[PDB]
Amino acid sequence: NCEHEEIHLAGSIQPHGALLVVSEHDHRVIQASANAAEFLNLGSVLGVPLAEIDGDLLIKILPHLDPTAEGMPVAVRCRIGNPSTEYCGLMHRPPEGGLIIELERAGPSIDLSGTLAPALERIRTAGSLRALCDDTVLLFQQCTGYDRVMVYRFDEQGHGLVFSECHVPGLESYFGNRYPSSLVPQMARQLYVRQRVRVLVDVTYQPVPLEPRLSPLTGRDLDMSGCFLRSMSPIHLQFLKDMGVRATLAVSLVVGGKLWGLVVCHHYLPRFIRFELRAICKRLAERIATRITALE
């Protein structure tokens, strides 16, 4: 590989959310995505006390600063800006640099109450790895609506194999395509064991830089490992562009503390899935990984 890119030190986000970094000590915004004021209908954010950004959010965050009960990551409802809009704030604390708050607009959900159950039933009947993975791609396509859904399985040589696939009729089948191990570098695999869902809304996005780049607390790039808005590796973006894919969802399948494979979804238009469905996807994949585990 390909093992040298520090993909967690991206210094920028995708433009469909905003990112704030709050000091644990004075609770001011010490770093933010450059779009944050515009996205949040605020005049400014950098250097502003959280009390001014939104007092209720500050009140929400304060208990999470107890080192004996940090209770993160957490997803909180908040209302910010003037005019005021509802957001989901996904908050976590990297080892250094402060408290990160990533904000997505509240919006329409996908409703799963009539369709999740038959898809899960099918998974439960699966008696082989083949059946389980075929049922996985159907379940994730039903739940998420992506144009193509795959189980990308690492073989005994670490090559990537498109082991199961479904797609909307007329699209290309990648079923059975096999790829070099380096297309998913070990460093990326390692991150994906911890950060189990990635959503790339539009491959062609213009990254939104952090301001400042370097954390004022460390003098170093911010650790964005846990950021769902993180900008992705340009080499990977180029890969997807060369295939004509516009958006992706990827969910880790973790077995034995290692990346067994991925549920990989492609869309030919921009696509976002909101917090709750990302959480559901993560859990569904953990349940499937328990089954794989058992199947050998």
Contact residues for ligand BLA, defined by CB under 6 A: 1-2, 5, 7, 152, 160, 162, 174, 179, 182-185, 188, 198, 200, 232-233, 235-236, 239, 248, 250, 262, 264
In the complex with ligand BLA, the residue whose CB is nearer, 122 or 159, is 159
* Contacts of 28-31 spanning 24+ positions with Cβ under 8 A: 29/53, 30/98, 30/215, 30/216, 30/217, 31/97, 31/98, 31/210, 31/211, 31/212, 31/215, 31/216, 31/222
Q: Which is nearer to ligand BLA, 12 or 215 (CB)?
A: 12
| CB nearer ligand BLA, residue 85 or residue 177 | 177
| Minimum CB–partner distance for residue 295 and ligand BLA (Å) | 22
CB 241, min distance to ligand BLA, A: 11
**In the bound complex, what is the minimum distance in angstroms from residue 293's beta carbon to ligand BLA?**
21
Q: Residue number with the shortest CB distance to ligand BLA? A: 2
- Identify which of residues 94 and 160 has a Cβ nearer to ligand BLA in the complex: 160
Minimum distance, C-beta of residue 9 to ligand BLA, in the bound complex (Å): 11
**Residue with Cβ nearer ligand BLA (103 or 245):** 245
CB of 280 to ligand BLA, least distance (A): 17
